[PDB]
Design a protein around this ligand. Structure first.
Ligand SMILES: [Ca+2]
Ligand SMILES: [Ca+2]
Lengths: 171, 49
């Protein structure tokens, strides 16, 4: 019924270019928060902080989308493993009771935007831009994704499909 | 279990969003649990035993 899905602005990229991965939730009822683990290929790509215009550090938060923007103590978490190509981040409405009480649930929209800079010519066959998959601190999750509702419940992993990012190609 | 990492609220050996959601569930219920506790929890975010 629900989905995690993504989209890019361009799939043909030259070295030096930036490709932005927008990550959406779709029909996640009363969505309150998410955490992702996202593996990328460190030979070809480097995560780029488009807000600070510099490389990620291990604490860098991706750009926001439209969800989780309300004043319900919206809080970020991030701890990457950049040497190994693993992004680990999430955001949540910490004040669940107030969010719940708003009677204005979110369920569909962009939750984050992760930009990669191409640092080596992309192979001719293409590469997957990134993959959602469990790192060591999401050992209990399915496909690198945890979603939650405004009761603070884990939104069950059989209620939604994670749609993996597709390929990028050299210009 | 024997290992109880600081911030491991559900005792699974890892610090992730499921732990933060336990803070969250109690938000508004140093004597309180609020956004100062989250800052500390975020120090530990991602740690595994
Ligand atoms: Ca835990
Ligand atoms: Ca406190």
């Amino acid at each position: 019924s629900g989905s995690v899905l993504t989209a890019i602005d361009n799939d043909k990229v030259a070295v030096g270019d930036k490709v932005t991965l927008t990550i959406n939730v779709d029909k996640i009822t009363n969505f309150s928060g998410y955490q992702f683990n996202i593996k990328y290929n460190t030979t070809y790509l480097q995560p780029w902080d488009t807000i600070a215009d510099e490389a990620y550090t291990d604490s860098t938060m991706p750009d926001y989308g439209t969800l989780l923007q309300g004043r319900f103590n919206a809080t970020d978490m991030s701890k990457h493993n950049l040497s190994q190509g693993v992004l680990n981040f999430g955001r949540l409405y910490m004040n669940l009771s107030a969010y719940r009480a708003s009677g204005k649930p979110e369920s569909t929209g962009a939750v984050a935007k992760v930009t990669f800079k191409v640092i080596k010519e992309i192979p001719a066959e293409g590469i997957k831009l990134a993959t959602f998959e469990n790192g060591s601190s999401m050992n209990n999750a399915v496909d690198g994704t945890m979603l939650f509702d405004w009761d603070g419940n884990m939104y069950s992993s059989s209620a939604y499909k994670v749609v993996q990012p597709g390929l990028i190609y050299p210009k | 279990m024997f290992v109880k990492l600081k911030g491991d609220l559900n005792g699974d050996g890892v610090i992730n969003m499921a732990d933060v959601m336990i803070l969250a569930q109690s938000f508004g219920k140093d004597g309180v649990i609020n956004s100062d506790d989250a800052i500390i929890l975020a120090q530990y975010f991602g740690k595994t035993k």
